[PDB]
């Protein structure tokens, strides 16, 4: 039927940081994944639970497009079962995951000369983040016996740490925006289907 809003997700000039990932509900769209699959801009297109070529002709119950930014090294933290600081704390894709994670180098897009620190991750947390959830809580973390009393002190830390993104650095430090196309809820009539 109507045209898909898929362009807005990929072409959005701004992606929120990984700790608070923007989740875009998708409805009334035409599943035109042919352009995406034929695109040579996407460095990583590793789909889990579905084949990349089958995306063009398939009916999707509901699509959630969660987008964020990750450092150049360890872009594959998003892959289910992969444990790391950003994976365990900021965004944890559930081990049983049904969707395609697509990520590409955004150094020319999301990196500024001298550093762009707008994207930041929660380095410290009391417990590992529950799967597919967001915790924007920014209280002072307590790493000591003394109660921090909501106050930053010795053995007390802020949870969020900013990324180091420099255009000069190569594959080590480059903004690699990730768009996790989690879909196929299988809970309602499908509003997304392949073109006919």
């Amino acid at each position, epitope marked *: 039927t109507n045209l898909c809003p898929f362009g807005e997700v990929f072409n959005a000039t701004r992606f929120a940081s990984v700790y608070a990932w923007n989740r875009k509900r998708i409805s009334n769209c035409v599943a035109d994944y042919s352009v995406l699959y034929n695109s040579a801009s996407f460095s990583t297109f590793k789909c889990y639970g579905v084949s990349p070529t089958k995306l063009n002709d398939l009916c999707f119950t509901n699509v959630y497009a969660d987008s964020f930014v990750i450092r150049g090294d360890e872009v594959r933290q998003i892959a289910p079962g992969q444990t790391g600081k950003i994976a365990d704390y900021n965004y944890k894709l559930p081990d049983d995951f049904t969707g395609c994670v697509i990520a590409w180098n955004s150094n020319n897009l999301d990196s500024k000369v001298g550093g762009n*620190y707008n994207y930041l991750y929660r380095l410290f947390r009391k417990s590992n983040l529950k799967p597919f959830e967001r915790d924007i809580s920014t209280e002072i973390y307590q790493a000591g016996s003394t109660p921090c*009393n*909501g106050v*930053e002190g010795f053995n007390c830390y802020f949870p*969020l740490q900013s990324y180091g993104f420099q255009p000069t650095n190569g594959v080590g430090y480059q903004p690699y925006r990730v768009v996790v196309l989690s879909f196929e809820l299988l809970h309602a009539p499908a509003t997304v289907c392949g073109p006919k």
Partner: antibody
Amino acid sequence: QVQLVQSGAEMKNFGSSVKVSCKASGGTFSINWVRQAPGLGLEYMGRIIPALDRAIYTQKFQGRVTITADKSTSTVYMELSGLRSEDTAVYYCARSVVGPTPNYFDPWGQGTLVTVSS
Amino acid sequence: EIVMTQSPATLSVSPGERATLSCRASQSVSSDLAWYQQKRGQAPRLLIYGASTRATGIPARFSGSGSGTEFTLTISSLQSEDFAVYYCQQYNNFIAFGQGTRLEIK
């Protein structure tokens, strides 16, 4: 190069509150509060992230210091309700990369001298 | 409760090729030091945002060094202007300012 410009009241009487704010350049860089007693070691009061508007204080300065953020001009204010005779200390506005600890103060602010008249 | 004790607080050197400054910690520091140049009647400026990686400005001839408990700073070109109070700073655990090391022309 150019320090973050800050404005603050000077020579307030006892019991008054000084409101000092600095203009952030722009971004998610945290703004941290550094108190320097005259001819003594520097001290750290707290911080507030401008983007997230999160309040951070120190056990030494809990309650006495209050920090507010004005998003329109991207300025973060500092109100100090209780003033003491020894509290006549310059309060520095420092921009640092937001981290679990206040990172390197790159760069510092102008620096506002405050004196107390008993 | 980490205090950045500085042993040569009154360190003083006449202009020369070599200058030595020191900084110590009560507990282990994972090379998260910083040096701030606080000139007389001036706002401080960052010098070594890393443990030894000098700043993006013009800290030419200024070189951090050391890791762990012991830290040191050396400068090849001791000009008159750069003479100031250098405040060792540690943020491995919490923001902890050293008492400060004045530098004099003695």
